[PDB]
Each structure stands twice: as C-alpha cells, then as structure tokens.
Amino acid sequence: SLIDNERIEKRSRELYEKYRDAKKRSLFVTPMETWLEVKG
Amino acid sequence: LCEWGHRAVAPASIDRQSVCVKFLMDELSEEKKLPVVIVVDGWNLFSHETHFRYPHPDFLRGLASFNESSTDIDLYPQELPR
Amino acid sequence: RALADSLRAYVEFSTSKRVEPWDARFKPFDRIEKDGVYVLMRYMMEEKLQLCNYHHRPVKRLFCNIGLMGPQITTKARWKPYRFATNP
Amino acid sequence: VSTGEFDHPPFQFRQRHTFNTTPLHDANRFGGRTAYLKDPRTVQFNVDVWCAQQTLRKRWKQRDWEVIEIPFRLVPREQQRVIPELYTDIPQMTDPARNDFSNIRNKVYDREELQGVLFPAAGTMLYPPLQRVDKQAMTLDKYL
Amino acid sequence: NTFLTSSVATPPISVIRTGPKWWADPERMVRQKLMYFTLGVDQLPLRRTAVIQRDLQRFHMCKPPPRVGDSTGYKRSRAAQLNTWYRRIQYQEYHMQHLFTRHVWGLLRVYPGNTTKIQGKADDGYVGYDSVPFHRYNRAPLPFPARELYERRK
C-alpha cells in the first residue's frame, strides 16, 4: 500500500481536478475516464 | 463529508464514495490530537488478500470482432492473481 | 435438403441474441440496473456481451474471467435452465 | 472427516419433488453439474472425478507456500540431512534431539528469513525485517 | 431457496408418520427452533412435538401386551384419545412450520417453489419456469421472465 506513496498521493491530488471537471458533464464519472486506459 | 459521500443517488454514489473515503482517511491520518480507536473484525482478511481478481486485459484493451484476435475470454476461464 | 435445413437453423440460431442468460430474480443480478453488477456489465462488458450475443456459456465464462464478481457469480447466482435460456 | 456427499443416489424408481425427496439429477446435488447427466458405474466415476476436483482445489488453496529449490549449503541445519522421498520411510520427525517432533516434510519457512540466500544480488532489504514480539515483557496480557 | 420445481403435496398424517426419519429429524427440529428463536417467539408447539417424539421413540420397539378385553372400553377409548391429542399437537406444529417459513421467505425476498402461496406477495400459486407452460391450476399463460414478487434493490 505504501510503495510509491508520495508519487501516488501527488497523482491522486492531480487527478481529483480531472474528476471534478468531468462531473460537470456526466452524471456518473468512470475510472476509465479518469486514469484507467480503456481504448477502442 | 461522510453525509455527502454516502447520501447520493446511484450510480453517482459509486464515484462519490471513493473520493469521500480517500479524503476521510487523509484527514484522519492528519489528525494528531483526538484518540481514535479502530476496531476491525477479522484483520487477517484485510492483511492477506481479497477473493476478487484483476480483470483480464482484453476487457480493457478493447476489441473489434471476436474471431479476429482469437481471444479465449469467453472460451476458457482463467485465474488472474488475487 | 433436410440436413441443409437443420444445419442452417443451427448456424442461424448460433448468432441469435435470444435472451440475457442471467436470472434477474436472484442476486447478484437482483440489484437495480443503475448500480452493482449492472454498472460493471454496462461499462466493461457491453463490447463483449453483444459480440457473444448473450449465449449462456460465453456470458458465464466472461463473468468468470472478469473476476471482479468473484466465485460467487456462479456459487450463488442462479441462471436460467438450458431450454429456458435457449428460447428467445 | 467430511460431511459432504460422495456417492450418487441410487435409481430404483422415478422420484418426485416431495417433502423428504427431490428429483434425481436436479440442479441442487453437486453444484448443478448434474446437467451433464445412465450407467451407475460411469455416473459414480464422474462424481468421483468431481469430488477429486474439489479436494484438489481446496488442498491447493490451503497451500500458502512455494517450493523454491535451494542449494544444500544455503539451507537450515534441520534440512541439511537426507530426507527420504514421500512414502519411502516412516513420517520423519524434524529433530527429536531438540524436542522438535514435527513432520519435516510439512515445514514452511517464512520468506522474510532466507533473504540472505534468496536475492543475494539485491543489497537492499526488499522485505523489511520481521517484527517479533517480546515474550518477556509486561504487556496487557501479562498484567493479569 | 433453490428448490424451484413443481412439487407434490403430502397429507400431514403421512408427513408425521416418518417421525425420527424426517418429520422429527433432530437436525431439522433444531434449525426450526433456531428460526423461531431468531424471530423471537416461544417454541412451545415445537417443544411439545419434541417431547412427544422423544417419549414415542423411547418405546417404539416395545410390543403392547394382548389386551384381555374390557366391555366398558374406557381403556381403549382413553388410549385413542391421547393418541389423537398427540396427533393434533403435531398437526399444529406442522402448520406453524409452513406458516412461519413462508413469512420469513416473504421477509427475506426469497422466491418459493412453483404453485407456492406467500400471503403478502402471491395469494395464488406462484409459478416460475415450470415444465407446463401455463398455470397448473388457473390455465393462464405465465409471463417471461417469471413474475418478480419483490423489488429490485438489494
């Protein structure tokens, strides 16, 4: 759980911004939308 | 904060609970004055593993047609690391 | 031509989307369509369930492979019987 | 001892779904895998195969260790002996001399103990040292 | 529940004639007592059945003596009276078992077997995925999928 603790914290704080921005367009936000990579 | 996290309409609660719990854990870790007692039944479960497995990478990569990639996701079950 | 009829019928039905195999009566498929297992199906399985055309064997094996449901997805989830899923 | 059913029910007549009886070959007996089903002998053989599958899966889930093959020199004194192969000699006790009466074959070594022989190339402790509690210390348990 | 097939009714007398085999099977009686205890109600008919069956099983191997014969017949009449009293207590407990099990199934949202009545949910027979395509008694077409007696939320 603590491997890359600082880097993961930085990434999560950066990603919360993207999540909040996305919540203004879709009722349900998705990990595939935020960080998980689901392509065609 | 807890009320905002857990009081919501589905599926909007699914993505809200993660944010709520992450921030609640961060703030509880920050607090350094109030004694907080954490009691958990069955700590071995939180210690070793959960029976959930990682999804097969085919469900994430994406597919066009099934006979193309010769994927066996719907042909044979597998056991991803827990 | 009699053999032709049977073979064509089999091949045509193979492509059919007869029914969703899972029994909505019993959990975990009991939950409302907007939460629980249906969210995972809608956002990770739509591209695969439609490919397999909702056949019970592909559906069960895909559910097993995804793993986020776990062994319970067949240890406690009740599907429809053979013919009861076969009929559209 | 196991309380699960091992034999297939006999067929001497057609049963019904009643208070004390259920239809033969229903989706309740062996986890619904009777949908594949004639001859009692072959049916019992298939049930035996299924029971062996269950035994194997639980026996393997019970397994939490791994069988890395270590060279003789880099090995504990208890395993620096000659260990007969399975079913060749009497179940061997680890060390009767040191009052360790335990099947040596079932011994399991914590992975955070052989880092000196495993991973000799990595100069950093990939697994932190194991924390061992002090028995000779007044603690909440020993206070009453 | 996972016994969802069409079933066959059985008269309470033939249900109770089993006794130690299934009717008074000790494990089954223990879990019925556990159902009642969890619901929070006294298991009095169950305990009457339990003591009846214990005392009957204590003697089931003894052959009664050949009766000499009394014209008044008061002895035979009293014996039959007590036998029927025991049978009636067992009938009461038999009915209680079904009543409370159906109530609990309705509470927990458990679908019963075909042609089973749950007081709140399905007054008439509930039939789901039966061999016969229509109602066994009402001669009407059952819908696909089987009727959902309860809500969807878990």
Next chain:
Amino acid sequence: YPFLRRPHINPSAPYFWSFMTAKSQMAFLPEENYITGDWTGKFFVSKRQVYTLQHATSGAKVRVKIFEFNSPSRWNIGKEMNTLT
C-alpha cells in the same frame, strides 16, 4: 445385459461429426476404404466404409447390406455407410 456390450450397435446438425463417427478426425481412414490384398472383388462393401469423393464420382457400383446408394452427392462424404443408410 452388460453395459454397451450388445452385439448389435434423424440426423443431428451440430453433432453431425460427433454421432456414430470416429473420435479423432486426424485418424486415417479405416480398413474398409482400402484394398487390403489380392482380391477377386467384393460382393458388398463394409457398412463402416467412409464415403469419399471417389464414391461421389462415377462410382461403378455401391452395395450395402440391400441398398443401392445410386444418388451420389457431395453431402454424403465424410460419414460412414451405417449412418448414410
């Protein structure tokens, strides 16, 4: 009677290659499809002989215990005469 030990041994589409047919498809054709040794000719061909393209061709004669099989077509190839009856 012992199981499946009798002296005497409606086509299915999905199991067309798996009913009364050899377990393995890689296996070569049986003794009944080939001329073993010096012969004068067969009165009948064995009912286990696999229909072939040569059979679907001119096919001088076809006799199976009596059946004529004088309706040659490519749909009859790949299966034994017992289930081609």
Next chain:
Amino acid sequence: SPHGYIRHFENEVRDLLQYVDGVTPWKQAQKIRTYWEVRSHHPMPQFNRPEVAMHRNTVGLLPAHMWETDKKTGKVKSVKD
C-alpha cells in the same frame, strides 16, 4: 525374450520399423488419405460444437453458394448438385 509391456520390446520395435520401411513403397503409401482430407470436399466440413465455441459460428461458414432458401420461414427447400 522380453515379456509383458511393449516398452520392454526394445529391439523388436526397431526390427518392425526397419522391415516395414524396407517393404513399403511410398508409391503405395501416397494413396492413404486422412479423414479431414476426405472431409475437405464437403461443402461445409467444419462445425463448431455446442460444448465450447458454438457462438463463434458466423454466417460465412455456411455453403450459401449452392442452395436457395424460402423468403417466408427461411429454411432451405432444395439443394443443387
């Protein structure tokens, strides 16, 4: 003389193989075809079993160039030579 299993007949298997090789000509051996080789002439020799991959069946696997189907029910009424 070895007895019992075939794995104990070390020399005799070698002798049988050498003899059969020296006696069998490839001109005689070219004739035996395989079951799948015979099947290949069928309009549609390969089917997907209902055990594993029945769902893989695609409309292209059918021999649709040699028969005609009715427009109402869809089943084949006749077949061509």
Next chain:
Amino acid sequence: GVHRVGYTHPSTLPVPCAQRWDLRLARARIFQEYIEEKAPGAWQLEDERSM
C-alpha cells in the same frame, strides 16, 4: 494461474546444485520413462477412493 515453467542452469546460480529437472531427465534416461509433453499442469487428480 497461467504461467510459463522456468529453469535455472546450475552455472547461473551463485552456488551450483543439481537441478530437479536434470534429475528427472536422468531418471528418464535410466528407466526409459516416456514423458508426455502435453500433460496439463492443472489436472492433478488423485483417486481418493483408493488413496
């Protein structure tokens, strides 16, 4: 857990030791043991009825 079975040559290890696959091949040479290549690693069933 689908995986690929591994092998370490005695030379690569810091202190060499006769590997168990090498011992297996030695046993196969001595006793002429046919080793089926396609033997599945998942199908290891023992007849409990006898064992």
Next chain:
Amino acid sequence: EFDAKGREYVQYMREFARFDPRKSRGNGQKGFPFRDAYLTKMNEANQKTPPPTLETIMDRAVREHHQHARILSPLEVQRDVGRLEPIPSYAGKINADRSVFPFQWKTEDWYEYEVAKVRNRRFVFENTEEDGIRGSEVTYKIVLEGFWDHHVMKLAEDVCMFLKDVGRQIVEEKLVAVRRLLQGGAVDPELLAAFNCARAGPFGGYDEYDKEEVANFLRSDLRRLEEQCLSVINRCNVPVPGATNIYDPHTSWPHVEKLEPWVRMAEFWTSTAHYEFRKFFRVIICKLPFQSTEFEKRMYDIRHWLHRQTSCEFHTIYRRNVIHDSAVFPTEHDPATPTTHEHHRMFSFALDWQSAPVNRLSTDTVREGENWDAVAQRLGCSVGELKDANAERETIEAGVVINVPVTATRRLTSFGATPLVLPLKTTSAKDGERIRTWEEAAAILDCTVEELQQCNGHAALTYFDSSVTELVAPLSCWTSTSESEFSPVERVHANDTLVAIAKRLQCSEEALRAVNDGITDVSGLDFVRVPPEARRPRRLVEPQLRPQAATDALLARTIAEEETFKLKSIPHLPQNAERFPHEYHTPTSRFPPTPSETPATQDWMAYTAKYLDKQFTISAEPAPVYNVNKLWPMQQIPGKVDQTPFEEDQTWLLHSIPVQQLEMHHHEKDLQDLPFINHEQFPRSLEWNAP
C-alpha cells in the same frame, strides 16, 4: 488375564515403549511404530498439556485443607459396600500428558503413515547379520496349498518334522567344520590378497594387512556363525510331542505361519445360488546362516512325496555378491549439450537410446610421433599403468595398436558424431574417373556393398547418375577421436574461480593459464578452453544416445524415396483448425487446454505496472535467483506454458472437461474383464507376497 484386544494393545504399547527409528531400518511394516502414539508425539498441539483448571485446583485444595478429606481417585474409592479391595498400584500414579494419551494427530500425517505402511510391505531385507531368530543368510519359504485347512495343517506338521531333522543334521555337520576351523587353520593367499587389494586403505594411503589379522577376521566371522548354528540346533531340539508349538519361531525350527486363504465366490442362476472356491495356504520358513545346496536339494525333493491333492511352491531369498565395475559403468561430467525431453519421447526407448552399458574402446591406434607420455596424456591414463597394460611393446611406433587401460578417463565411444564423407568423381580410383561400381566404392570404404547401400539409399535407387557427389560412409566405419568426442570448451559457473575450474577438470592450474592466454580472473568470461591434459573432461554429447546415422539406416528406404520424389510436406491440420479448438481433438491432446499466455500476469505488481498503473516503479514481484516450481510436486517441461490447478469451484465447473460416456478402460484391468468376471491366472492368496 486379558482379552484379545487388551493383549493386542498392550503389545502395541510395549513395542512403542521400546521403539527406535534407527532400529527400524531395512525392515518392512514391522519397522513402523505404534501409529497412534507416534502421530500423537509428532502432533505439536499435543506437546502442551494444559494444567488443571483453577476450579479443579480450588476444589481439591478446599477439600484437602479446609475439610481434612482428600479427594480420592475413581480407582481409589471403594465401590463394594460389602467388601474392601486393595488399591491398585496404578491408582492415580499415571501422569496425564497430551503427547502420550489420548491420541490426537494431523490428518495429512496419518494419510502419509497409512500410505507408506501399505507401500513398504515388501521392502524387507530378510537376511541380515543379526543374532538369534532375526539373523540368517538364506531364507527358504515353502507355500503349501490345499483344498482344506486341516489338510494343509497336517501337511505342514509333516514337512516340519522332516525339515527339523534334516536341518539339524546339516547344521550339525556344518558346526563340526566350524569348530575344526576355529581350532586351527592356514590363511589362504587369495584371501590375503583380497584384503591387500585396495589401493589406499582407511589409514592414510596404502595399507598392508597380515595373515594374522586376516585370521582374526575369519575367527570373528566363524564365531558368529557358530552362535547362529547353535541357536538353530537348540531350537530344532526344543519341540517335543508332549509340548510342541511349531507356529512360534522361538520354540521350533522351522516355523509355520498362516496365510489368508484364496476365496473366489461366484453367484449364478439355479433363483440364484452362491458357491465359492477356496484354497488354504500355510508357509513354512527355514532361515539358515549359510547356503547349503544339499538342503536346497532335500527341500526341492518334497513335491514328490507331498500329501494328496496338495501343492507347494518355493521362495528363495539368498545373499549374492554383485560387482559395480566402475570401468564399464563410469562416472562422467554431464555432457556439454544436455538431453531434452525430445530424447525421452514416445517410442524413444527404441530409437534414441543405446542399452546400458555404452561400449568404450579398449583398443587405440597410435598417432604420428606420439611420445610415450603423450599417448598417456591423450588417454587420460598414467604412464605406469599404460606400461603395465601394454607391457608387450617396449616402445611406441606410429600406427601400431595399443591397449588403453580401463581406468583411462579419455576413453572413446564406438563411433563419432561427426559423419564420414567420401567424395566420388575422384581420379584416385583405378579408372581415373567417377567411381560407378558399387563394390569398388565399398572396397575403398572397406565396407560391404549392403552397408554402403543402406547409408546412402538415394544413389542405390537412382542406380550411378552424375547427380550423386556426396557418399556417406556407413556408421560401422567412421571413428571417434578425442578432439571431437570431448568438448574443447567448458562453461564457467557463476562466482567460479580458476582453481575451481582446474579441480573440476582435474587439470593443472598452469595448464589452464597457458591454454587461456594467461588469464587470472574468469569473472568476465562465460566459456574457457579446456587444456588437453584434463583428466576429467566433459563429453560433447551423451554416450548412451543413438547416432542419427543408426536411425537413418533403420529408415533407409524412407530417406531414399524422400530425396528421390522430393516431397516437401503436407499439413497435419487444416489451415482453419486453430479457429475451432474443440474440433480436430488430436488423440494425444487432453483437457484442460492451456489458455494463451498473457504477457504481464505473473503477479499483481506486473499487472499494476503494465495495465493499471503505467508509472509503477517495481516492474514485478521480486523473483529469487534459484528455481521456483509452481506446479509442485509436478515437474513440467521447462519453457512450456502451463496452468496451475485452479482454486475456485466455478473454474472447474465452467471449464470444458468431457464426462465419461463409453465403457471404462484401464491399462491392466482389461485382462480382468469386469468386476463381476475378474479372470485370475492362479488361485494365489491376495495376501501373497513376492519375495
């Protein structure tokens, strides 16, 4: 006294009390300890016996002290209200320990105990150098079979009264000779040489025994033989008609032991009837501390006066000396190119491997200008031993034949792996043109016309046509030379050192240093050239493996016609086979099919690094340096993708495993037709043991 079970368990407990795993060696099921006590000892939870409960201690103390009335044991209280018995000595004196009683054990340990006990039934070394009954050298067992238990019992009594007297006289006449030899004798020079045969003895190097020491060894052996003979004679004299017991090994000699009767019940129509054949057995065991062919003769001659309708069979377990000739069966370094699983394939036992032992050339030819020590160094033998082996010739001349000493460590196998070719079109022949005749080429190769035919095949069937240039000589012709036979280079182990390589190759450190350009360290090297003086070199390939030439000769016509017709290939499976897995189910394939290998799935760290967390630091869960066996205890072919047995029920349920539908087949239960038929060869007891 005691009942049967009480006696049985008292004997069990005494055996366990005097049990010793070291004394339980070389023995069958009789070496296994008292199962219950042994497993209770092994169980760890039973290694801690809880002390009495606080309530028990409080009550005992209250009655002992506050009330002046000690608590008596249930065995110490007087139950008979009209009689007063004496308290037993064991009343309250037996301590309670969980490791001794009651017996609790682990299920897996019990399973192993049972399986090992049933599998080590015949792993008994009957003839040992023990004392009394256990000690013997030759064990004879006579299994007497009859149709009635009393018939066989009476026959056993007769045969015992026979063998008792015969063995008495024979052991008597052996005892006379033993006593005479003890009184005095002479040492055999053959025996003294046998003692002073070893090169280096236990004490330092060469040892030198004396005839006096040899006679002392003989005296010890003959004394123990005398003790064994006297025990046999005394046991022979014990039995008397007034009080005789021939079923006890301690009382009489020989003793009779019982064997389970062979019973075969058959049920058939009549309305059904059950009738069973029966055959009763008795085993007479004679254990002699010497091999007497006279006794063997008199024992074999019993079948001629055997009782009516009774038969007998003889089992003999005798000590025999077996030599392990290290010369014909030597120890060699594991070859440079190791064997793979292909060499142990189906039908490989006939095509790939020579029968052991592999021939090693005892004869050599001398090369050009080879020095006497040069030949010895090339053969890996010492100069002195080479002289001793080839004392016929004082000096070595080129091209002469020499006898390589058996202990030479560079001895050569039959034929080298490098083929011998002989190009035609050469003008060296008589015609000065292409050699066309077959026998002229055969004479050039010094082989037979047929040997030359088989090794080519193509020239024979095209028989010459100018298309033939390369002519391979027959395997029986070309030779193996040490340079090709032995690997010129050897791989260096990790963290190896030059002294270690020198010791491994039995060469000289300076030899390695000179051959390898004077290198000091080897850490920057993976392969080092071996000196030609290495006394323990590593062969290029396994000596026991067949040459490809032998199998080509086996398949001579196949290759000839293949090269003639130029047939390339024909696919075994059609090009669309892969798309349909369940079809084309080849007979060698078997469920469960292995899915494809996902690139990064071996652990959660790899999965997170590749698919979930792209910026994950640790690529994968740390993997040790030594070899980890996932499919333990199953050894899979290395480098093969495989799947470990599943841990969920749904995987096994949903995975494609067919069910048995036709009749069951077993590779040995087919001769026994069915469980109800079960053909048997002879009516031997199911308890019968092969010696």
